[PDB]
Motif scaffolding. Structure first.
Motif, PDB file in Angstrom:
ATOM      1  N   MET A 251       0.842  -1.201   0.000  1.00  0.00           N
ATOM      2  CA  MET A 251       0.000   0.000   0.000  1.00  0.00           C
ATOM      3  C   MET A 251       0.876   1.250   0.000  1.00  0.00           C
ATOM      4  O   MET A 251       1.836   1.330   0.787  1.00  0.00           O
ATOM      5  N   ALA A 252       0.541   2.207  -0.856  1.00  0.00           N
ATOM      6  CA  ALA A 252       1.220   3.500  -0.878  1.00  0.00           C
ATOM      7  C   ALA A 252       0.362   4.532  -0.161  1.00  0.00           C
ATOM      8  O   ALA A 252      -0.895   4.559  -0.303  1.00  0.00           O
ATOM      9  N   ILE A 253       1.024   5.411   0.591  1.00  0.00           N
ATOM     10  CA  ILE A 253       0.333   6.547   1.194  1.00  0.00           C
ATOM     11  C   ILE A 253       0.759   7.723   0.310  1.00  0.00           C
ATOM     12  O   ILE A 253       1.947   7.901   0.114  1.00  0.00           O
ATOM     13  N   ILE A 254      -0.189   8.513  -0.198  1.00  0.00           N
ATOM     14  CA  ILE A 254       0.121   9.529  -1.225  1.00  0.00           C
ATOM     15  C   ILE A 254      -0.191  10.909  -0.635  1.00  0.00           C
ATOM     16  O   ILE A 254      -1.327  11.127  -0.138  1.00  0.00           O
ATOM     17  N   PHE A 255       0.793  11.808  -0.652  1.00  0.00           N
ATOM     18  CA  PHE A 255       0.685  13.160   0.006  1.00  0.00           C
ATOM     19  C   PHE A 255       0.714  14.270  -1.026  1.00  0.00           C
ATOM     20  O   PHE A 255       1.713  14.409  -1.785  1.00  0.00           O
ATOM     21  N   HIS A 256      -0.327  15.111  -0.964  1.00  0.00           N
ATOM     22  CA  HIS A 256      -0.462  16.298  -1.868  1.00  0.00           C
ATOM     23  C   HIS A 256       0.452  17.461  -1.417  1.00  0.00           C
ATOM     24  O   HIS A 256       0.975  17.415  -0.279  1.00  0.00           O
ATOM     25  N   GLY A 257       0.527  18.532  -2.212  1.00  0.00           N
ATOM     26  CA  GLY A 257       1.394  19.631  -1.863  1.00  0.00           C
ATOM     27  C   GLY A 257       0.639  20.841  -1.270  1.00  0.00           C
ATOM     28  O   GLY A 257      -0.568  20.761  -0.913  1.00  0.00           O
ATOM     29  N   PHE A 258       1.379  21.937  -1.110  1.00  0.00           N
ATOM     30  CA  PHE A 258       0.888  23.206  -0.491  1.00  0.00           C
ATOM     31  C   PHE A 258      -0.313  23.793  -1.285  1.00  0.00           C
ATOM     32  O   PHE A 258      -0.176  24.033  -2.520  1.00  0.00           O
ATOM     33  N   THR A 259      -1.445  23.996  -0.592  1.00  0.00           N
ATOM     34  CA  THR A 259      -2.736  24.474  -1.174  1.00  0.00           C
ATOM     35  C   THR A 259      -3.419  23.505  -2.160  1.00  0.00           C
ATOM     36  O   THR A 259      -4.455  23.869  -2.773  1.00  0.00           O
TER      37      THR A 259
END
Ligand code: NA
Ligand code: NA
Ligand code: NA
Ligand code: NA
Ligand code: NA
Ligand code: NA
Ligand code: NA
Ligand code: NA
Lengths: 251, 251
Positions: free
Chosen positions: B33-41
């Protein structure tokens, strides 16, 4: 202020958690204010912190003292507390203090793990905070976590457990992972205003080497080694801590 | 799992804030499983993050993608978000993932400020995380805060304002004070397992120098400079990002 003096229970919020504090309000329209931080598993009303606030108020220096998250009257589980989110609490408190129009200069006073929170907060606000007092600042909590031994409970520092039973409590694994890598001296050394370091020679909880190390890192620190004193400056040693802290902040 | 496949909205809590996520559930009893993180705003459902999750699910790799605090569907004001409390969010998500009995290996995938969150979380969990993919990781946000210029809004880095109007939003002064002192490379370099670094040569938001610097700090990294690509790997460049990330995590 000019019209009301005495104590008051006060409440702030940080990310959805309520933090509970006590404000000591002195005489006068304008006054200085110390923010006072307790240590690991303590609370805002230990004898040491109460007597510090009392002595400051005698000098008309206001103070506030809050329970950190996971402690005392404040929200959050102890298991979810780390030094980082205590710094986040401390920043929410400083928001409250720096917007009070009666507050002239702001001082930080921290005991043990509260001294690490104070020293790091002052390094993030070196333009705002005017003076810092650290009492037995627990900068050794980093080295302890790297060793794998937090006040006598041991664990593998290379593979910290999800949670660590600790006396009556459960310490978070994330507390320990954060501790190992906290840039305590890097951040703290940015504060170049006056620092008072107070440490008892017989402290068995935090080595006096912690304050000896802070005294090398700061540009303007004074070190007081209290002969015979223990970690909490208990009983006959309390006044050494209280007097030095009050004298330091009065001028 | 063996019986249910497809999407599902999921919710976690960190310090009193709800975080909202999307889980892509693949076939099989056991899967990575991958945990996926978005960026600023940004948010968990940008085109780039959706297409990453979709491509992973085609390979039976599960994923979860949450809105950070102060973003998208999650709680908290944008003004109160910092990189540190996004790392605290990311740790709450990893708690959720590491206790799912279907999850075999755990991967972190982060874009832009989400790449700094991923790189720092992997350095705090180098014993647990198996692989990391950073897409245009925004390690330059530290240098920007030290310069006093965050994507074209300027301020005094020696005296950061309490709050900083930023387009339609208000950036916290505490975000900037934290950014200046974040130990990004120190913490991230502790992860010695495989890292894939993907950066577009024409990224105007995060200098490709950020990934060049991560490639020097990691013990096991592969750097992919995508000729002509912009910060979000938009339009004709998207598949370069999606393919490299999927290939990396498949083996
Ligand atoms: Na309590
Ligand atoms: Na560091
Ligand atoms: Na000195
Ligand atoms: Na000094
Ligand atoms: Na929103
Ligand atoms: Na550092
Ligand atoms: Na390498
Ligand atoms: Na490398």
């Amino acid at each position: 202020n000019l019209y009301f003096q005495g104590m008051a229970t006060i409440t702030l919020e940080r990310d959805g958690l309520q933090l509970v504090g006590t404000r000591e309000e002195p005489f006068g329209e304008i006054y200085d204010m110390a923010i006072i931080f307790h240590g690991f598993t303590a609370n805002r009303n230990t004898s040491l912190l109460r007597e510090i606030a009392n002595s400051l108020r005698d000098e008309n220096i206001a103070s506030v003292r809050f329970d950190f998250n996971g402690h005392g009257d404040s929200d959050g589980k102890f298991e979810n507390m780390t030094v980082l989110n205590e710094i986040e609490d401390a920043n929410a408190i400083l928001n409250y203090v720096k917007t009070d129009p009666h507050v002239r200069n702001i001082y930080l006073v921290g005991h043990a793990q509260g001294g690490v929170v104070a020293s790091m907060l002052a390094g993030l606000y070196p333009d705002l905070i005017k003076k810092v007092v650290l009492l037995a600042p627990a900068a050794t909590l980093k080295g302890d976590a790297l060793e794998g031994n937090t006040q006598g409970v041991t664990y593998n520092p290379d593979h910290i457990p999800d949670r660590l039973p600790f006396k009556d409590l459960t310490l978070g694994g994330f507390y320990l992972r954060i501790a190992q890598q906290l840039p305590i001296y890097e951040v703290s050394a940015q504060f170049t205003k006056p620092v008072c370091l107070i440490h008892g020679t017989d402290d068995t909880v935090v080595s006096p080497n912690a304050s000896k190390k802070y005294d090398q890192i700061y540009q303007n620190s004074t070190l007081h080694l209290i002969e015979g004193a223990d970690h909490c400056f208990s009983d006959s040693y309390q006044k050494n801590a209280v007097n030095l802290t009050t004298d330091f902040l009065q001028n």
